[PDB]
């Protein structure tokens, strides 16, 4: 996957897939789905579905929610209050054992991030009266830091893969809906049909 601040964005449309098979499996640790009840995903039809994927630490799953606090929820990825989306998160401890030291996350920013903002940039963060230039030092810091994902750590340090699904409902066309099932046929009997 990608970094948390450079979260990966995917656009899916023009397909038919079953959303029920996701929560049916027991391998999904966290499923907080605010937009609609889990069993109604297949019932309703949507458009141009968007998926945002990243990796967070163990004890920050509560940060990913519409309209709450959090350092990651403020400088890395923030959900607007009017967000009828759906959130899945699952452990990936066995996929980063030694541990992994290639993960970066924003820690310092002037203000909170905008909704669905792909803010990619690098700069020496300054927090002092004196201007910051040249080499880093006092009041001149790097806003990106690594993760302590040691293979001998418990909850709070185990990497978690987090995906957020969002959508727009019937802007004008319809491309992706829930699957439909069909039964067998009968003959020589007065039947009410729905062909």
């Amino acid at each position, epitope marked *: 996957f990608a970094s948390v601040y450079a979260w990966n964005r995917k656009r899916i449309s023009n397909c038919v897939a079953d959303y029920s098979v996701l929560y049916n499996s027991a391998s999904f640790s966290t499923f907080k789905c605010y937009g609609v009840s889990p069993t109604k995903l297949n019932d309703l039809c949507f458009t141009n579905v968007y998926a945002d994927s990243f990796v967070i630490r163990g004890d920050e799953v509560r940060q990913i929610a519409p309209g709450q606090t959090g350092k990651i929820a403020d400088y890395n990825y923030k959900l607007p209050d009017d967000f009828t989306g759906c959130v899945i998160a699952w452990n990936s401890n066995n996929l980063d054992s030694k541990g992994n030291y290639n993960y970066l996350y924003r820690l310092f920013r002037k203000s909170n991030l905008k909704p669905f903002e792909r803010d990619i940039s690098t700069e020496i963060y300054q*927090a*002092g*009266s*004196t201007p910051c230039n040249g080499v880093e*030092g*006092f*009041n001149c*810091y790097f806003p990106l830091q690594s993760y302590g994902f040691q293979p001998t750590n418990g909850v709070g340090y185990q990497p978690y893969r987090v995906v957020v699904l969002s959508f727009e409902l019937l802007h004008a066309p319809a491309t992706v809906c829930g699957p439909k099932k069909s039964t067998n046929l009968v003959k020589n009997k007065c039947v009410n049909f729905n062909f």
Partner: antibody
Amino acid sequence: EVQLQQSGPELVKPGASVKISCKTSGYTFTEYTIYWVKQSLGKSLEWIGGNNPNNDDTTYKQFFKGKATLTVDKSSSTAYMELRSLTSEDSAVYYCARDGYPYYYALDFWGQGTSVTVSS
Amino acid sequence: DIVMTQSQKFMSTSVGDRVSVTCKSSQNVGTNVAWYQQKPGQSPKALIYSASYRYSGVPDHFTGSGSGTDFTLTISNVQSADLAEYFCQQYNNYPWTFGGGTKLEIKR
């Protein structure tokens, strides 16, 4: 809503260690750094140094060796300075100040200062 | 290197004449200064920011200067509460160091 209460006058002995406390209350302490300066009875102002409450950073001037030490705590929300080698001329007043990053750079708020006098 | 003299240590104005003090600095390092008033006994009070701005909490009637490696400040007049010390500021490098200060005396 910014205020600063410091300690009173102190009498020190050469070749000893003393402590001076700068207390900050009524406002957030995590973001803005804390600066320390001296006044030797109306002479030129010397920037003793500065410290960062968040990163626990420490910065001195060009010539400060001898008592170069900084310390802060959030439970008491204050700062402690340790003075050593009070040989012959350190009798002066210490001033503890706080700056503002969004506005009012360069030591907007000051304190009453603590006067330390060296004697036998 | 690091030196601040502002070409004077103390200046005297008797009555009515406008007061102006420079803050000539060292070679080009930047453009950021300040001026503080030091009353005889209590904490310094900030007078001007970067030699040309205004203070919300101070009845500011002041005249400043431009930019570059030289700075100047002009105050309204010599009131009855102007006898104090004048301190200039220079915050570019971490080893902060100010000048010797300026003293305003009412020449009776």
